Amino acid sequence: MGPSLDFALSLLRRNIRQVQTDQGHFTMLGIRDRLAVLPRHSQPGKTIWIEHKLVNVLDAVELVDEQGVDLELTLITLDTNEKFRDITKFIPENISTASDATLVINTEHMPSMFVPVGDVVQYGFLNLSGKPTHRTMMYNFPTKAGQCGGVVTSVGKIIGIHIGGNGRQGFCAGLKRSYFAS
Numbered sequence: 001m002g003p004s005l006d007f008a009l010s011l012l013r014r015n016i017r018q019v020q021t022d023q024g025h026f027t028m029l030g031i032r033d034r035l036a037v038l039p040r041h042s043q044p045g046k047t048i049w050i051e052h053k054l055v056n057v058l059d060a061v062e063l064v065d066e067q068g069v070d071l072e073l074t075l076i077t078l079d080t081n082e083k084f085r086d087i088t089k090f091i092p093e094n095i096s097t098a099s100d101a102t103l104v105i106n107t108e109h110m111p112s113m114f115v116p117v118g119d120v121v122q123y124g125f126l127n128l129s130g131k132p133t134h135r136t137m138m139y140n141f142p143t144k145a146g147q148c149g150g151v152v153t154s155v156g157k158i159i160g161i162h163i164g165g166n167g168r169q170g171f172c173a174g175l176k177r178s179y180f181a182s
């Protein structure tokens, strides 16, 4: 509710970017330095649109956890002029569920949008259009196409990235701090 909403708003300007790839429109969380995270499904190429600018991509590396499981997110590094404000400290050391979370969407079509998704609960194994992953979490909210990459936040942590849904529920890849270690 209110507390996750205001924390979510504090991330928006400095860290939550509108992007476009050949696959469509996505929300992108910048984490630190020139490092950001996107859904694998966005399939970033050699350039990517960020806000109004076509930006060269330094690399895109699929995020695979310490158990060898693809998390369906890719870590992208960018030929941006400025570094992102470092939000490492807001990514929890442990994958975290949360009550009354906020999902932040920021795309050209859904700009600066805060979605009260309610409680985010453990889900675990998830088969997303035939691609299996784990460590996912679920919220009973009817998320939509165009919300992938959306940032799931608690009172003061960034807990997940929206990756899929079935029309009545939504699912995020869980985040923990070690995923972003250099």
Ligand SMILES: CCOC(=O)CC[C@H](C[C@@H]1CCNC1=O)NC(=O)[C@@H](CC(=O)[C@@H](NC(=O)c1cc(C)on1)C(C)C)Cc1ccc(F)cc1
Pocket (backbone or CB within 6 Å): 023, 024, 025, 041, 072, 126, 127, 128, 129, 130, 131, 132, 143, 144, 145, 146, 147, 148, 163, 164, 165, 166, 167, 169, 170, 171
């Ligand atoms: C570029 C445009 O594409 C997009 O908009 C990305 C947006 C949507 C957001 C969905 C869109 C709808 N409700 C939502 O919240 N995401 C996907 O579509 C994903 C597929 C699903 O959500 C599928 N769901 C399940 O499999 C699923 C399983 C359970 C359990 O619940 N849902 C549905 C398409 C059927 C794409 C994907 C494929 C393979 C993966 F490794 C990982 C992801």
